[PDB]
Structures are given as C-alpha cells and as structure tokens.
A paper describes a structure:
The LSU from sample 1 was solved at ∼5 Å resolution. We observed a helix-shaped structural element stretching from the 50S subunit association interface. Moreover, during model building, we noticed the lack of density for H68 and H69 of 23S rRNA based on the starting model of the Hma ribosome 50S subunit. Additionally, H71 moved 8 Å from the original position. This suggests that the stretched density is attributed to H68 and H69. Furthermore, the density map showed a flexible upper part of H68. The molecular docking of the Sac 70S ribosome model on Sac LSU indicates that the stretched helical density clashes with the plate form of 30S SSU. This result suggests that LSU is incompatible with 70S formation in the current conformation. In contrast, the large-scale movement of H68 and H69 in the Sac 50S ribosome prevents the formation of these inter-subunit bridges. Consistent with results from 2D PAGE and mass spectroscopy, we identified the density and built de novo models for three bona fide r-proteins (aL45, aL46 and aL47).
Author numbering:
A (entry chain AL5P): 8 to 175
B (entry chain L10E): 4 to 167
C (entry chain L21E): 2 to 98
D (entry chain L18P): 2 to 194
The structure:
RNA sequence: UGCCCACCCGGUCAUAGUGAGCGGGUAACACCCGGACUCGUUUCGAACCCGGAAGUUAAGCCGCUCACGUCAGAGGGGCCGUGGGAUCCGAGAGGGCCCGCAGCCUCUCUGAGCUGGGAUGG
RNA sequence: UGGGGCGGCACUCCCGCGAAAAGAUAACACGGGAGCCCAAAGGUCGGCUCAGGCGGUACAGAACGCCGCCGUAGAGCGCAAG
RNA sequence: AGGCAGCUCGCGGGGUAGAGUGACAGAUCGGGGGCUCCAGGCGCCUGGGGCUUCCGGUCUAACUCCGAACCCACGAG
C-alpha cells in the first residue's frame, strides 16, 4: 500500500521553557527540565533587544529541550494525563502543528517535588510528520514539498485521538 | 506679484519636497465637487492651447467662482459634478532678498540670487491638456458652457472648450 | 561649484546594473577563454567586482591584448592622439565583433 | 517570480547542484577539476576541463564497471568502493595524458576519514599528482577492517550485516568478514590491464 | 540497433519561473534502513558523517494540464520625439513644412526550454 | 567677490544633481559629507539567512521565547550620498 | 609611405529627449467593497476615526521597469 508511507507519524516534540530573563533562574530551569526529559537541554540566545520585558540580543532567555524517536513518544505519555482534557482543536494549525503549555508544571503526574528552586509553568509543542521531509532539510537539491504532501489538521486530530486516547 | 511674472518657463521643474524645504501651503484644498458617481449625460471637457505654468492662486479663485455659479444654478449635490484635473506639483521660487536685504547694504544685487519658495503651480507640458471638466445631463449644457467659460476668464492662458 | 574628482564620480547609473543579472559573477564562460597577444577586446566594467576596476574614462571601448601579467591582462587603447596601457583582470573584457 | 524586479538564480542553483563561488575560483585560475561526486548507490569520479559549449571531461569512471569489468562483490557506496574507483580514475587519467588537477567537492562536508578523502587517495596512489592536505582518510578504512570488525559481531544480531542484495539472495555470496582480502585481488586485477 | 529518457559534469541564465492537478518508475534517482567504528550534533544519527539497504511513485525528481509571472509575434488602444535648412509663420513662447530616423506604454490573440561532455533505461 | 566693506567660503578632499545617453565641461547653483572610527568593525574557513507578515502555545503582551507557513532584499552591511 | 579633418558598412558603448508610476523611491486626487472604533438618532440607521481590497486620475534635476534620434570606439571599405 502506498498509504503506508503517506501515513502521519510523531516527531521532534519541543520542550521549551519561557523565562524571558537571564540569570539565577535559567540554571534551576535547566536542571529542572533535565530530569523531566533525561537529556541535556540548550539555552536560547535572545533575539533583537526590546529594552522592555528585559530582553537583549545574545542573552540566554530560555531553555529548550528536544526529544526524538522512542523518546519523544514516551515523553508525551507522561505529560498527557496532566493535560488530557486541556487539548483543544483550536490549537491545531493547517500544517499538522499544535502546541500546549501549562501555567504551573506541578500538574504533571511525575516524581517531582517542591524544592527550594521553586515552581514553573511549561510550554510543549507537538510536531507531526509525513515521511519525506528530509528533502526540505537535506543539503542537496533543496526544495519544498507541496501542500498535498503536508499533514492536514484533521489527520492530526486522528493521530492524537489514536495512539494517545486523548480528549477531543 | 503679477501673474505675468511666472507665465513662461524659467528652467527645469521643481518637485522634490525633501530637497526643497518650506513650501507655502497651496490655496487649493478641495479638488472634486458635486455628486460624483452620479448619472450624467453631457461630457464636456476643458482644453488649453499654449504652454505655460498656472499659479494655484488663480486656480483656487477659479475653483470658487465655478462652484458659486453652479451652486446658485440648481444645487451643490444635484445632477452635476466638478473635478479639477491638475495639481500644483510645480513650485516657483523668487529672489525676495532684494526686498528685505535690498535696503540695508547687505548682499544685494544678483549676489546669491537663487530663488525662494513662495508659491506652487500646476505644470502644463502637453499641447491641449485637461485642466478641469464637468459632467451634466442633456438639459443643462447651456449653463455649463459659460460655467467653464467664466472660469476660463481668470486663467492666464488661452483656453478651449468642447462638447461630448 | 567645481565637482570632486572622485574615482567613481558622476556614475549614478554608469555602475547601475540591469536587475536581470544581479548577484555574484554569472558569466564564467567569458572568463575561462584566454587571450594572447594581438587580440582585440571590448572593455565592459562589471560594477559588482571590486577587483581591478578600470577607471570610467575608458569604458566601452576597443582594446588590444599586448601581454599578460599575473591573473590579469594589460590592454592598449587609443583615447586621443596618445597611447595608454590598462592593466585589468579579465572579468570586464568581451571579445570584439 | 513576482514581477520585473524578481531575479532568477541559475538552474543548478535552483536545483542545488553546484556552488558557483567555488566554480568561480577554478575558472579564474584555470584549474582542471577533479570531481568525486557520490550517489546513494555508486561512486562518481571525473576529470573536467572548461570549454565554450560547456565543461569537457578528459576521463571518467564509475562504480558500475567494478562489478562488471572487475567483479566487485561488496557494496558500491562504501569506503572500499570509494577508494577502488579513485584508483581506477588515475589509471584512466594516467594514460589519458593529464598529470595534475584539483579536487572539486561542492556539497560534501570535508570530514577526515570520509568517503571523499578515501576516493582521492586512490587516485593519488594510482599515480595521479594532486597536492592534498595531510588530514585525509585512515588506512584501515580503505580495506574496510572496521566493516569486517563490525561484521564480526554477527553473533549478536542473529544474522550477517550484508542482508543479501537485490540479486545476492542466491547469486552473490556476500562475505563481510573476508572483505579486505577481496580488495587486493581486484586491486591486483586492476593494477595490470 | 538506434536515438531520446532521465542521471552525473555543464553552457545559455526565466520563452527555461512560481503555484496547483495528474501521469511515469521494479534500471537509473530519491524516498527510505541503521548507526558499533569515521565524523558529528554550544540536545538529538533531525541534519551532517558512516554502514547500509526492506519498502515505495506518496514526496522530490520527471512528464503533462491550468493558472499566473516572463520573451516574442500580430492586432487594438495610449502617448509622442529628434537630427538637417531657410531675411518661413508667430512679438514671444510656439508651430507648420520640405531632407533622415524613430521608439514608448497599455489591452486582445498566438507561441514559449535550448544546448556540450560521459556511465544507466527504452 | 556681479564696486569695496560687512556677509559667507563656493580656498583642502568626497556623493548626487546640475551636465544635454563618448569624454571634458561654468555658477557666491541645489541637496549633502570628511579632517574619523575599528585588534576588531581586519584575513581566512566553516555554519545560518534578513525586514516584515500569518496560524498555535502560561505567565505571553502588536512587539521578550517556542512550533509551523510566506516573505527577490522591501533588513543589514561603522560614519553623508551614490 | 603612409596619414586621416568626412562618409558607408560591420561590430560595440550609452540612460538624455520621451514614456511609465501595481517596477523601486517619493508627491498627489477620488470613488467602491469589506473589517474595526467613536458620536448621534430610532438591534438598526446616520456621521466621524483607523485598517484592508478593488477601480480611476494627477508629477518628479537629485525615481527609472523601458528608451530613441543622437554622439562616440575599432576594423574594413
């Protein structure tokens, strides 16, 4: 069946912490997500300085983590029960993308505690893939795929209801 | 200053505002009168004859006189519409320094005699270019004829009319 | 008001290039061919290339290949009733005729 | 394309084939190109020279003749295959009449010990004179000792690494451990022709 | 045979583009398999690098259709110059006329990839 | 120096315009700059692609971050312009 | 023993006259559609404010997607 590789698969979940400042909070946030993800995160350099919201160019203003096959999929398993009902179809785009955050990351049913570091919220982004994006990302014969090969919103909902038994 | 002072062309155009500071505000502010998009039948226009530049000051006066004549005729929103075509893009400059500095032994004479912006003109470059026009119905061309013609009385240059 | 004798003075469109051929040097085919003595060439400055830019005073003319030095060539051109030599990199040279 | 302002990069650039800036330098310096391009199934080597109607390749060789004219048995897109064809290129190049040229790379990341450096060394060992930086391949990579060493772990994955090819099911007995030994015999085969 | 059909190496640098739809692949080309060693990801085998290679025409690639962009041909319309000369007209501005040349925009219709060097496929 | 003085520097060099599709070409013509700054703002190699806009995510906000789409330069390239 | 103040042919260079402004940079007049906010009147209507789209027009020494006549280089005649 040609549809077996027209299928939609989960890929590269985004684990991003938004703090918007630099110093004395990134370190704890860096290690806080470390045991949540099991991998070493990466700081985010600041974009163009705005002089308000305390943001400057080149200043580390966030923590990002990324998980891959057999790790991204299991990472979703432990965060879904916290926010299974939080899922809204309104957060799904036309390109098979959806992101979901939490006001406070205590909601996760993990082995977390409340140390002196404090408490934080969290932002999570979900990426859906139809096999073959490598051409858009490979070095040679760079090109773009048409909308037909793209992942649509409806099938994205299916791949969330399926394989994850999530609400909506 | 008399209208004969700037009838002909003295040099190139004068357009770039960013290069020419401090332009006095043109007299004309409204360029369209009457019920545009209204139904009209007679299609008479206005045509010039010889080249030259027209000061906005006269045009604004020409704008006013045309309106009153039509306004008293039927109405201002009635089955008529007046639109003036050109815009005072051109700018005139005059060596006014002979007025102030021309009586105190300052750098008088042709010394540093570049012009100074005091007025604007709607430039004419083509033989027989539109200046204004008016749209009416079949029953009021007779009032429209002199209506343009009376306006033409104040224009510096010889003008021509037509019927369409 | 005397004008400055800048080496690129009064060139507001002399070094302007038609938008259809912007970017880095496209015409590699012209460069690869090599000149020898006695050849006749036409100078056409590429504004993009900053190396070996001949002065504007001799643009769009007929040139003669009299020799070679380094990666560049030297060219003889008559302008008035004198003689002059223009040492230039080849990327502003096009064969005559 | 959105109007008269829009400019179009070249067909190759539109298709991402060649870096012109690199090509630019060769043109101005009249460098004779050595092109060890790679594809997912074979290896491509050429010796090019510029001309008006386009580039001219003095000599050319392909992986396909190794399994056809020299009886290559292993993979066609790995290090030993990469080295073998490069050695072939020089022998064609040597009898061609060329002596010196420059490697042309383009879109291959210059990794030490990679396939690209493995290719160029073979031409060097073939006798082709091409100056090269001394951080190229590693000797063990050419014979594929690592591959056979990797193959020697077949006791672990319940099977040999060389899952039989499109035709190696009942026709080609891939011998992953006995890899370097197969290298010399073809190398000996190609050395004299 | 063959030659074109793609490919690698190109020239031309949009008439060759972009976007959508459809068609073609058991070779070629990719997608795609997996990373112990090479190398490598200011995380990740994503990508790159290496080892590969089941599946597969859905991507891409390729061809075709339609759109727009774009080169031309013709038609319609828009707009209009300049050299050469006169005790030519006009006070001037300006204009005609004899001698030589034109082009410009905008709509309609009609075409719209060419080509050198080598290993697959027919 | 459109008498001289006062005025100003058109007195040193640079951008455009003047200036009329070779060059050169005046004005006390017009619109402007320089008497520096950079050990990195320099050389090379490597990697990424901007301004801007759209959709979704806690604090989150038009504009701090994050995930996708478009974006032929509309950013940026030290200092004026080209 | 060639030389070149002219012309012709061939072969090149050009952004000026002009023309265009949805091709940049600006200047500039109006209408239509939609979105948004405010004021008034009886959810609606009117007026005003901001945004978008479409349609139309008016200029550029320091605008040029184009572009002559024309002038110039060289070879041959």
């Amino acid at each position: 069946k040609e549809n077996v590789m027209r299928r939609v698969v989960l890929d590269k979940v985004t684990v991003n912490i938004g703090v918007g400042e630099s110093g004395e909070r990134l370190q704890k946030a860096y290690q806080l997500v470390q045991e949540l993800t099991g991998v070493k995160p990466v700081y985010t350099k600041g974009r163009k300085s705005i002089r308000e919201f305390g943001v400057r160019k080149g200043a580390p203003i966030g923590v990002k983590a990324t998980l891959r096959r057999q790790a991204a999929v299991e990472f979703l398993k432990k965060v879904l029960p916290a926010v299974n009902f939080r899922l809204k179809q309104s957060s799904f785009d036309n390109y098979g993308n959806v992101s979901f955050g939490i006001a406070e990351h205590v909601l996760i049913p993990g082995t977390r505690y409340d140390p002196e570091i404090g408490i934080f919220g969290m932002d999570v982004a979900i990426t859906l893939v139809r096999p073959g994006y490598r051409t858009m990302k490979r070095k040679r014969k760079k090109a773009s795929i048409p909308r037909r090969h793209r992942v649509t919103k409806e099938e994205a909902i299916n791949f969330m209801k399926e394989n994850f038994n999530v609400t909506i | 200053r008399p209208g004969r002072c700037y009838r002909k062309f003295s040099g190139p155009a004068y357009t770039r505002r960013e290069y020419i500071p401090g332009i006095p505000m043109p007299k004309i502010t409204k360029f369209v009168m009457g019920n545009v998009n209204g139904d009209y039948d007679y299609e008479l226009r206005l045509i010039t004859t010889e080249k030259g530049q027209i000061r906005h000051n006269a045009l604004e006066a020409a704008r006013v006189i045309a309106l009153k004549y039509l306004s008293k005729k039927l109405a201002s929103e009635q089955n008529f519409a007046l639109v003036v075509t050109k815009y005072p893009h051109h700018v005139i400059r005059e060596n006014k320094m002979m007025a102030f500095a021309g009586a105190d032994r300052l750098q008088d004479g042709m010394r540093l005699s570049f012009g100074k912006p005091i007025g604007t003109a709607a430039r004419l470059e083509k033989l027989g270019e539109l200046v204004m026009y008016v749209r009416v119905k079949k029953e009021h061309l007779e009032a429209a004829k002199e209506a343009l013609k009376i306006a033409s009385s104040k224009l510096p240059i010889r003008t021509k009319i037509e019927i369409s | 008001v005397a004008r400055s004798k800048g080496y690129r003075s009064k060139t507001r469109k002399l070094l302007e290039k038609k938008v259809r051929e912007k970017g880095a040097i496209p015409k590699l085919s012209l460069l690869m061919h090599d000149y020898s003595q006695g050849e006749y060439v036409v100078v056409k400055i590429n504004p993009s290339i900053h190396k070996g830019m001949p002065h504007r005073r001799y643009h769009g003319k007929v040139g003669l290949v009299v020799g070679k030095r380094g990666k560049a060539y030297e060219v003889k051109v008559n302008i008035g009733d004198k003689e002059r030599v223009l040492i230039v990199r080849p990327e502003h040279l096009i064969p005559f005729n | 394309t959105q109007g008269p302002n829009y400019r179009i990069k070249f067909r190759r650039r539109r298709e991402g084939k060649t870096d012109y800036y690199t090509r630019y330098t060769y043109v101005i310096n009249n460098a004779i190109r050595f092109v060890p391009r790679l594809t997912n199934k074979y290896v491509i080597v050429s010796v090019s020279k510029f001309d008006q109607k386009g580039d001219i390749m003095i000599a050319y060789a392909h992986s396909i003749e190794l399994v056809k004219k020299y009886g290559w048995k292993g993979d066609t897109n790995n290090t030993p295959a990469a080295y073998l064809t490069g050695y072939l290129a020089g022998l064609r190049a040597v009898k061609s009449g060329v002596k010196a040229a420059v490697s042309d790379i383009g879109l291959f990341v210059p990794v030490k010990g990679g396939r690209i450096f493995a290719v160029i060394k073979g031409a060097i060992d073939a006798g082709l004179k091409v100056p090269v930086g001394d951080l190229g391949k590693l000797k063990d990579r050419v014979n594929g000792s690592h591959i056979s060493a990797y193959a020697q772990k077949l006791k672990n994955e319940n099977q040999e690494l060389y899952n039989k090819l499109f035709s190696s099911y009942i026709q080609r007995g891939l011998d992953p451990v006995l890899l370097p030994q197969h290298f010399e015999e073809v190398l000996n085969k190609i050395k004299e022709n």
